[PDB]
């Protein structure tokens, strides 16, 4: 299923999120060849209650560069084009929690991951509901390990805040939807940049990401 | 069936044409944005030098890619039979010359394919068409559409103006008919406004035609 990831692929991302009773559409393209994502996300509903950094990780691991020596270690591509389910529970230290279910599939000459998010237990005038996070991101390593039992995968994000840091504990689970592949323990190193179209009246985020794999 | 036309769509076009016993094959590739009514296409005459100029073949060569504005969504025949598609038949009377008769099938294979035979009869040698006296250009037109309760589809009638190198104009009467292939949708009378530009890749040695097209709908106030 890596065949599908030779060259450029169109991307659809739709998130249905509910944070403390407060109820994003993204388009662009991804190059598994370069681990390069270019995406613009659109809130639609109104002024988002959470900052733009919290939602990103919740915003396509299959587009990551697994080097040629690491080919047989690509869970994400192997369930193609039938796809995966990605569930995460995300504990923000000293704050609330996201609980996320995602489906990552081809529904095209074009990919899609359609996602529900339910955020509960966030404190008002906390760092999250108060939008005290900077419009930026740090680099991270993605420690991946196999799950013979669930036939899939499992896997602390630093959000820059007034100079403090909010950590966000990520517990992730990935299950194939067809009958696909598992690889040994490995790590994904990331970079993401936030930007904005100053022509855009609505609340938005332009995203550029670079992710390559390493570890054995 | 509009789901399929959100964003960019790949296009395949194949023509099998016979004009006064002259057999030729044209293959076209590119993409279309129903969002912008935007077609970009390169056509290739696999067989040789085309017998007929390249401007006669453009209409015969995807009206589902026309932008119908938001008030006009329920007036989109072409979108509604997709992915199973339509048949597009035309008889084209070139005033003071010969006639094309064209049958086409427009479907998804998610690339949008229309496979077409053309048969031209009674064109006069050293007429404007067989003599290649047409300029390599196009005009803007209105595409007048009307429903067909009986044939469960569409008709359309229009006189395409082809510029002649001698300053004259060749008119070409288009009688068109569209029928669904599945069990799809119909709209009231409305009109499609068009623009097309011809260009060439100066690197390909075969003769060919690069196309950019802009088509939007209007008519219901």
Q: How far apart are CA B140 and CA B63, in angstroms?
A: 15
Single out the residue of A79, A66, A36 nearest to residue A215, CA to CA.
A66
Contact A108 B110 (CB under 8 A): yes
Give the other-Cβ count within 10 Å of A75's Cβ.
Answer: 22
Q: Which helix (H) or strand (E) segment is A76 a member of?
A: helix A75-78
CATH number at residue A172: 2.40.155.10
Minimal C-alpha gap between B110 and chain A (Å)? 6
Distance CA A170, CA A93 (A): 11
The stretches of B44-192 forming alpha helices (DSSP H) are: 77-80
CB A162 within 8 A of CB A67: no
Nearest-by-CA chain B residue for A28: B7
Resolution in A: 3.4
Query: At A44, is the secondary structure helix, strand, or coil?
Result: coil
Q: Note whether A110 contacts B9, CB cutoff 8 Å.
A: no
Identify which of B133, B185, B161, B127 has the alpha carbon closest to the alpha carbon of residue B58. Answer: B161
* A&B contacts, CB < 8 Å: 10
Using a CB-CB distance cutoff of 8 angstroms, which residues of chain B are in contact with residue A108?
110
Residues in chain B closer than 8 A to A40 (CB atoms): none
Q: Which residues pair with A122 in a beta bridge?
A: none
Chain A residues close to B7, C-beta within 8 Å? 10, 27, 110
Residue B83 DSSP class = T
Residue B155, token pair as written in the block: 């008709």
Q: Collapsing DSSP states into helix, strand and coil, what is residue A178?
A: coil
In sequence order, the β-bridge partners of residue A188 are A142, A213
Cβ–Cβ under 8 Å, residues A130 and A124: yes
Measured CA to CA, the distance from residue B134 to residue B142 in angstroms comes to 21
**Distance, CA of A64 to CA of A171 (rounded, Å):** 19
Chain A residues in contact with B110 (beta carbon < 8 A): 108-110
- Please report which helix (H) or strand (E) contains residue A75, including its range: helix A75-78
Q: How far is CA B162 from CA A206, B17, B141, B194, in A?
A: 45, 20, 11, 14
Rounded to a whole number of angstroms, the distance from the CA of A66 to the nearest CA of chain B is 28
Our measurement of the distance from residue A162's CA atom to the centroid of its chain's CA atoms, rounded to an integer in Å, reads 26
Closest chain B residue by Cα to residue A109: B110
Please name the helix (run of DSSP H) or strand (run of DSSP E) that holds residue A54, with its range, or none.
Answer: helix A52-55
Q: Which residues of B touch A (CB under 8 A)?
A: 7-10, 110-111
Spatial contact of A206 and A197, defined as CB atoms under 8 Å apart: yes
Query: Best mutation site among A8, A27, A109, A111 for testing chain B: the one with the most B CBs within 10 Å?
Result: A109
Helix, strand and coil percent figures for chain A, each rounded to 5: 10, 50, 45
Give the gap in angstroms from C-alpha B189 to the nearest C-alpha of chain A.
33
CA distances from B130 to A186, B25, B26, B59, B133 (A): 67, 17, 17, 18, 8
**In B141-154, which positions are buried (b, 16+ CB within 10 angstroms) versus exposed (e)?**
bebbbebeeeeebb
| Dihedral of alpha carbons B55, B56, B58, B64, sign | positive
Q: How far is A110 from chain B (nearest CA, A)?
A: 9
User: Which residues of chain B make contact with A110, given a CB cutoff of 8 A?
Assistant: 7, 110
φ, ψ for residue B73 (rounded to 5)?
-65, -40
* CA-CA-CA-CA dihedral for B126, B132, B135, B138, to nearest 10: 100
Asked whether the bond before A81 is cis by omega within 30 degrees of 0, the reply is yes
B109: chain A residues, CB-CB within 8 Å: none
Task: Copy the structure tokens of residue B111.
Answer: 């690339």
From A49's Cα to the closest Cα of chain B, the distance in A is: 29
Taking an 8 Å cut-off on Cβ atoms, the answer to whether B111 and A109 are in contact is yes
Contacts for B22 with CB less than 8 Å, ≥ 6 apart: B51, B52
Burial class (CB in 10 A: 0-12, 13-18, 19+), A103: middle
Question: Chain B residues with CB inside 8 Å of A29's CB?
Answer: none
B20: left (phi over 0), alpha (psi -120 to 50) or beta: left
What residue in B sits closest to A9 (Cα-Cα)? B8
Domains in chain A: how many in total?
1
Q: Which domain holds residue B50?
A: 1-221
Alpha-carbon distance of A84 to A19, in angstroms, equals: 25
Going by their DSSP bridges, the two strands A25-31 and A36-42 should be labelled as antiparallel
Report whether A151 contacts A173 (CB < 8 A).
Answer: no
CA-wise closest residue to B96 among B70, B122, B75, B131? B122
3-state secondary structure of B75: helix
**Residue with the two structure tokens 């991307």:** A11
């Amino acid at each position: 299923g890596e065949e599908l990831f030779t060259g450029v692929v169109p991307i659809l991302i739709e998130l249905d999120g509910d944070v403390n009773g407060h109820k994003v559409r993204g388009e662009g393209e991804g190059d598994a060849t370069i681990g390069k994502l270019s995406l613009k996300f659109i809130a639609t509903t109104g002024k988002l209650p959470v900052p733009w950094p919290t939602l990103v990780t919740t915003l396509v691991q299959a587009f990551s560069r697994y080097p040629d020596h690491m080919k047989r270690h690509d869970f994400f591509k192997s369930a193609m084009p039938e796809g995966y389910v990605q569930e995460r529970t995300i504990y923000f230290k000293d704050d609330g929690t996201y609980k996320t279910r995602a489906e990552v599939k081809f529904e095209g000459c074009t990919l899609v991951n359609r996602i529900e998010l339910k955020g509960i237990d966030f404190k008002e005038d906390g760092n999250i509901l108060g939008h005290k996070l900077e419009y930026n991101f740090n680099s991270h390593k993605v420690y991946i390990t196999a799950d013979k039992q669930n036939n899939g995968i499992k896997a602390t994000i630093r959000h820059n805040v007034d100079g403090s840091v909010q950590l966000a504990d990520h517990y992730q689970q990935n299950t194939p939807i067809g009958d696909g592949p598992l690889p040994d323990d490995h790590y994904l190193s990331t970079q993401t940049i936030l930007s904005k179209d100053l022509n855009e009246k609505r609340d938005h985020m332009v995203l550029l990401e670079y992710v390559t794999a390493a570890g054995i």
